[PDB]
């Protein structure tokens, strides 16, 4: 018998879940800072009320609070070093995110580059950023605390330690972070969810999803993350698509939030792979395109790459996949019930009109190898977790026959 | 819809899973500290030579070790207060258990009266522990740190805050614990857990299903825990009479171990509820009386009794642990579909040969009102987590069925 060998590492976690939830954002943030940075994207949280709210309870709780609402889709260095000036300029001691996994990204960078600076600044976000074989800076216990409200049943980020920054300059799109990033409270808060519009609820859905399944095949045993993993497919097969065609539907919408909370837990203690590895690297090198669809786009190639490459252990895994998406019904150790999961991700990309070409989205050919090295250079981590190996051109010919 | 709300509290973790896995316990306490206080029984260890191994380890590491080899079953205050004497006569700075509940509980104890104590103690472990209204002592992070390597599948108690402590005084059996408590590594060597002989396997094991069955039906809404909780009893039900059977059977040793490692993160989000609060009596009131065996005896007359007074709700969650368990085939909400959790429970207490009346054991029927005071009294936070209310009767007339 194989045995099986792992180490669970799980930093402490504080889930804050329900309809209203909203109003706990200011007494949690106070016993960790009497004075907070804000940081939300533009628009939508402030159309929505959300943020009149928080900053409502933050200053009714007695926090301080400087707003930082410059956070795009698909945050950036500079960004990022703009909103630590702030938080070195005014002092804050506590970084507050409200918002989806760009807000709450931006907010653990913020949190890391004003933790580990002198006074006005010396350092970048992009210092603690993996780049090859660049010995990045260590993210020690000198990272602000960070609470998080999250907007999107999607990223995970409310419970990863993982902030994912690009670098305009290199276009690189990494995640890094550890127990020192990882949020101090989460708040999932139902009626800020429901406000997702369909198609961002169908995009954070699929990223639930890419998290779990992938969760799931990392090489190596990861025995504390596979029932959640597993339970987040189940829920999205039941409940997202239920989501995206009624945003009201309250049971959906807290299934999903779930799932987007089993998908964080699982993806600290387990690790991505090849799909996001070169998931990354397109919205890097095209920061419009949103990560759930750069994730969908590829998908099919580099399931049946896995599969096809794989093993006993990997398929059965692969088997469980396709039982939780309702595709198949038996789980079996086979390539051929392996392939099944390839069928119920069919599935669920049509459901959510998710199925496009990279063509579709503005990706052209002429970057692959760009985008090729860019997730070796900055994804190398989910390249190594992959269950089969990839090569340089093996990455590229997927990435054609996602095009 | 009923909106779902719920708050998850969960320790940082840190497992160390595999075979052989011992050889790490020396490094990961010299994290923590310099000298080490090692809390174990009073001859398995020994026996099997893995406490030599772990002297060996902490001291090749370099960590200075007291033995503290005097933990007998159902560990007393006495016990505990006196261990930490040592630790702070002789500057230990981290406790380290290799043992089973009885070994990691007297170590948190430890830890906890030896980090609040002044240089000769004023302060006992009865003083953190409920005992009514009682005003408890506060557990804070001046609790010594903890290293647990745990040689049983059954307590969950290297991945809980919880230590459970009798005072022969006055019989009471209560948990305690928080953050601060929790162990800062657990390691899991399935060569020292392989040793359990058959009938410590089944006891430990059974203790694994009880955690797990009562957090998932225990009152409110816990939904990271409930996967967790689910794989364990099915991971019970699949392998542990084939590690009751064969010891050496490594596979199932390994998902045992698993399971009581779900099954702790499970009891730290969920928590435990009617069946461990008249448990635990039986074991402050008989030291002898296992603690699985204990909640075996009275686990029949409790599930038809939460069964019978219950909603839909949990009559679902009940029905999900007979699939579980391979009583049933489909979940439904029902009082029939919950109850083939009944169904299911006795057969696996018939295949482990724990269904014995409280009798056999040698309680006695004069006991129950001294017993079911002791559920009320230091098990307060069970009764109130149990599903379904019961008044200082319903407790007496179960345990008569029991009898
Ligand atoms: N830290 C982590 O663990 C991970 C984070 N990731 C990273 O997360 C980012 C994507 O985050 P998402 O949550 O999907 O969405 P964004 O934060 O970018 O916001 C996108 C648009 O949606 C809007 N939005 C968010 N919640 C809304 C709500 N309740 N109602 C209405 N609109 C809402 C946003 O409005 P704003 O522009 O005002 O911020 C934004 O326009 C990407 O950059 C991704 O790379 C992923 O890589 C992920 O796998 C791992
Ligand atoms: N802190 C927590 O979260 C919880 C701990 N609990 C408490 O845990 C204690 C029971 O612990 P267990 O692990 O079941 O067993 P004990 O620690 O008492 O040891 C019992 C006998 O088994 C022996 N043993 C343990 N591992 C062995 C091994 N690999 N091979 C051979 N023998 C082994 C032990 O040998 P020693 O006497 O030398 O210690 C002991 O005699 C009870 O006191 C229980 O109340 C439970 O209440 C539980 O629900 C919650
Ligand atoms: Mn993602
Ligand atoms: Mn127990």
Redesign the interface.
């Known amino acids: 018998?194989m045995?099986?060998?792992?180490?669970?590492?799980?930093?402490?976690?504080?889930?804050?879940?329900?309809?209203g939830?909203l109003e706990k954002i200011g007494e949690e943030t106070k016993k960790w800072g009497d004075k907070a940075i804000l940081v939300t994207g533009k628009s939508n949280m402030k159309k929505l009320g959300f943020l009149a709210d928080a900053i409502d309870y933050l200053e009714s709780a007695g926090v301080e609070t400087v707003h930082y609402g410059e956070i795009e889709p698909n945050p950036t260095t500079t960004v990022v070093d703009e909103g630590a000036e702030i938080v070195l300029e005014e002092g804050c001691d506590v970084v507050v995110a409200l918002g989806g996994g760009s807000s709450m990204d931006a907010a653990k960078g913020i949190a890391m580059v004003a933790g580990h600076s002198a006074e006005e600044r010396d350092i970048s976000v992009w210092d603690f950023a993996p780049e090859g074989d660049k010995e990045t800076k260590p993210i020690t216990e000198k990272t602000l605390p960070v609470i998080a409200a999250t907007s999107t049943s999607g990223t995970g980020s409310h419970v990863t330690p993982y902030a994912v920054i690009t670098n305009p300059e290199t276009k690189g799109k990494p995640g890094f972070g550890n127990?020192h990033s990882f949020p101090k409270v989460s708040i999932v808060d139902?009626d800020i969810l429901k406000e997702m519009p369909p198609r961002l609820t169908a995009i954070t859905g699929y990223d639930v999803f890419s998290h779990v399944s992938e969760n799931l095949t990392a090489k190596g045993?990861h025995?504390?993350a596979?029932?959640?993993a597993?339970?987040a497919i189940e829920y999205v097969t039941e409940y997202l698509l239920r989501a995206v065609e009624d945003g009201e539907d309250?049971?959906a919408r807290?299934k999903m939030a779930?799932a987007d909370?089993?998908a964080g837990?699982s993806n600290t203690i387990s690790g991505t792979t090849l799909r996001h590895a070169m998931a990354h690297p397109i919205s890097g090198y095209y920061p419009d395109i949103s990560h759930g669809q750069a994730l969908a786009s590829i998908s099919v190639p580099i399931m049946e790459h896995n599969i096809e490459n794989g093993d006993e252990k990997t398929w059965e895994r692969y088997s469980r996949i396709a039982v939780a998406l309702d595709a198949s019904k038996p789980v079996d150790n086979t390539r051929q019930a392996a392939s099944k999961a390839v069928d119920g991700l069919k599935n669920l990309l049509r459901s959510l009109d998710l199925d496009k070409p990279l063509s579709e989205l503005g990706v052209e050919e002429e970057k692959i190898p760009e985008m090729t090295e860019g997730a070796f250079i900055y994804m190398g981590g989910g390249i190594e977790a992959n269950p089969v190996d990839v090569s340089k051109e093996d990455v590229k010919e997927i990435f054609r026959k996602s095009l």
């Open positions: 018998h045995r099986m060998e792992f180490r669970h590492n799980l930093p402490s976690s504080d889930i804050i879940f329900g309809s939830t127990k139902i045993d025995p504390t596979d029932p959640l597993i339970r309250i049971k807290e779930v909370t089993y837990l």
